[PDB]
Ligand SMILES: O=C(O)[C@@H](Cl)Cc1cnc[nH]1
């Protein structure tokens with residue numbers, strides 16, 4: 495029920511300041527952009543729905559790999575502590591915890607994410623399902639507070655969903671290098687990476703028939719409207735998903751149907767969009783198996799295991815110091 499440890503390194507005023515800075519920088523850039531972290535206001539609900547769309551294969555593909563190989567993953571890791579870069583709300587989390595329990599290894603769960611309220615809820619759910627488990631939640635941002643994750647036990651750190659694909663190569667390398675420097679001998683990283691495949695399937699996964707992804711994308715405008723007193727007309731922006739073959743990444747864009755004039759009153763800022771002008775809201779890099787090995791090695795980690803679905807749509811790596 496209520497048994498919990500929670501460390502909170504984020505402040506409400508500090509997040510508000512981060513949004514101010516990001517929106518000012520992004521809307522005044524020669525090529526306009528907004529960071530996708532701001533998708534996930536209570537947007538989080540829309541993303542949950544996205545994971546169940548027929549076109550969006552990543553979640554169910556990763557889940558099926560875990561469903562059939564979690565015992566092997568847990569045996570390879572030999573960890574008694576599961577660290578999740580994420581909130582611990584998924585079935586995937588339970589697949590891993592179940593296997594750790596079956597192996598009589600499980601002692602501790604450490605969820606790491608940016609919303610304290612969700613960490614509390616997940617902690618209560620996990621606590622009830624795995625009596626005796628120690629839960630140490632950390633509210634922090636995984637590009638700054640990784641050093642705050644406790645080093646107790648032998649740790650399996652998981653970063654699922656190909657969320658690592660939201661980082662472009664330079665910040666991605668810095669992230670993996672930093673994460674690797676918080677690991678001890680005996681610790682393991684379990685990394686989910688979505689893989690290069692048919693480009694039609696890729697684009698459709700980010701431009702579903704039902705329009706749910708379009709709603710998710712346009713909602714970042716609603717976040718700016720509410721939080722920074724802006725007047726984006728959401729109906730005036732078209733959802734566009736692109737495959738960038740040079741960078742091998744999916745991109746989400748918002749395209750102005752007609753010229754728009756947007757005042758972001760909280761920033762004392764007026765922003766103009768030309769008819770047809772596009773603003774970048776997300777990248778989702780896709781990986782080649784051989785390159786995953788290389789990126790891990792450059793970060794100081796040796797890939798010891800690789801799991802992929804029979805179609806080769808998605809990959810999971812286990813890597814060690
Ligand atoms: O890049 C993804 O696939 C996840 Cl992390 C976020 C997302 C899902 N649909 C649009 N963006």
Ligand SMILES: [Mg+2]
Nearest residue numbers: 759761762763
């Ligand atoms: Mg003013």
